Every structure is written in C-alpha cells, then in structure tokens.
Amino acid sequence: VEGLRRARYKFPGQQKIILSKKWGFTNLDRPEYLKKREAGEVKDDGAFVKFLSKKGSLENNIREFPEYFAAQA
Amino acid sequence: TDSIVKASNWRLVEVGRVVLIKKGQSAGKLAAIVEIIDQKKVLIDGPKAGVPRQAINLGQVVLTPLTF
C-alpha cells in the first residue's frame, strides 16, 4: 500500500488503490475459500488452483480429487 | 482593593427562560423555553398565553430578563 502508491505517480490520471478480498488472484471470497479448503475441493496446481465441479463425469472427479468425499477432517 | 471584574450581566438561554415571540403566527406572546435543542433552535410552549408547543429558531424570538 506504499509500493503501488510509489508507482501511482508514474501513471497519468487520478486512480486509486483498494485492498482486495477473495485471495486476490483468484475469485471466490476469503471465507468461502477457507470453507472450500476444509472440504477438499481445492487442488493445488502451480501458481493457480483448479476447482472441483459437480457436473463432470464421476470417475475422473474421484481420481483427481481423492480427499473430498472421504472421512478426512 | 479587590478584584474589580465588573459584570457583563447577560440574559441567557436556559431551561426555564421565558421569551417573547415577535415573528410568526404567535406574534408577540410570552412562551417558556422547555428544552433547548441546539445553538439556534429551542423548544418552547407558553400555554397560558396561547402559543402551541413548537420548535423555533432563536431569530424569531427575543429573550426576557425573567426566569422560573
């Protein structure tokens, strides 16, 4: 908030700086993401995370998400 | 020889100060300040003279030296 401020000068216009929500490279608000971490829908790929879907075929959804359905806390 | 700070004898706005209404439909009647709202509006009622209870700006009214 004092580093984008320091770059704010080297642009034209009068643009502002707001603090992001939602783990702000992805979508999906910070408490909703902390609830989806506990379910297991959230699969780490490099630098961005693929999300689970309920409309795909079931076989590859199980073999790509082994931890969602189970008795893991 | 003492502290000869003299008077500056005012009449003040306060709860209980009796006023004379000079502008409006009340037109020259005694009322009493009931509860003071802010620096400019007060709440008055003068019920034995006939003016209804109302908020008023302190421009329309003029203070009397009497109190109760």
Binding site: - | T1, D2, V5
Partner: protein, 191 residues
Amino acid sequence: MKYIQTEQQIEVPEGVTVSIKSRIVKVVGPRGTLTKNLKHIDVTFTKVNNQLIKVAVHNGGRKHVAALRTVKSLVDNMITGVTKGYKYKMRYVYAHFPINVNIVEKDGAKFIEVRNFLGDKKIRNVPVRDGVTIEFSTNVKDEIVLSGNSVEDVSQNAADLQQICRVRNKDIRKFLDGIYVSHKGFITEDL
C-alpha cells in the same frame, strides 16, 4: 467545531489586586502596576472569587479558543511580573575583539552603546524601553542583566540588544560572536 463555551481559570495570589473593565486590565502588586489593552480578542472575564477569575469564550471556533488560552497566558505573565518580576541574564561571546558595552545618556534617552563588535567602527546604539533596568554582573565576566516588570519590555529589549550584533557576509557557525540570552529567571532570589 463551534464549542459552546470554553473557559480558563486564572489564579490570583494574595498581594495583588486586579481591575478589569471592558477589556482594559490593571494589575497592582508589590513591585508596582501594569496595564494591558485586550480589546481586540473578544473574551469575557468573570470573578469567581478574590483568588480565581474565569475567562470564557461562548460559541467560539478554534482560533478563538486559542486566543482565550493566550489571554490566560498573558494575564498570568502580568501577575508573575508584578509579583516576582523578570530578569534576563545575557552573556557575551567574543573570540578576538572584546565587546565593549556602556550605558550612556543621549538627550535623556539612556541608550546602550556597543563598541568594537568584531572590530567594527560603527558605534551601535540600542534604546532602553520604559520600566526595564540594566545592571552588570558582579564576579562573572561578560554578562549583562536586564530586569523589569513585564515580559514584553524586558524580552524585546534583550532581543534588540541581541539582534544589533548580527554577523553579515560571513559564516555564522564559524563566527559565533554576539550577545546571546543565557538565563531567563525571576528578580526574587528564591525563585
């Protein structure tokens, strides 16, 4: 924010009597009398008793509350000047040319005469205001003492005696010479 009233309380000791009409202030005490014109500031003085006076600003802004506070400070300086009095001890600074300071009478005006400041040939002169006396220090080298009632007269005379010895066209942090105010005390010895 338009405060509805602000007040300050001035404490009055025993041996002084104050007389405030409209905004003219007269303070009488064991060292004499002082007067001050405060008609330009819109404050109200109110006696609560012989020892305490409240000043007040009713429906005032921010500047006006600051002006109330400085009215308190000025009346306090008048009271402490008429009880104790003020006494500034100034101390000379010279490296090579000894500053020579005399008290002369010129047409009844009692000037202070400064000679040989950094070897200057200009004979510098400073007038002495009304109510300030000037003594020289016993058994302390290079010290003048200005003592009087008000802080304004004493301090402005000390500042006139200071600023008449500025250094032009040279380095001020190398040429350090001048007459500087050293100590700001009271005339009474205990305080």
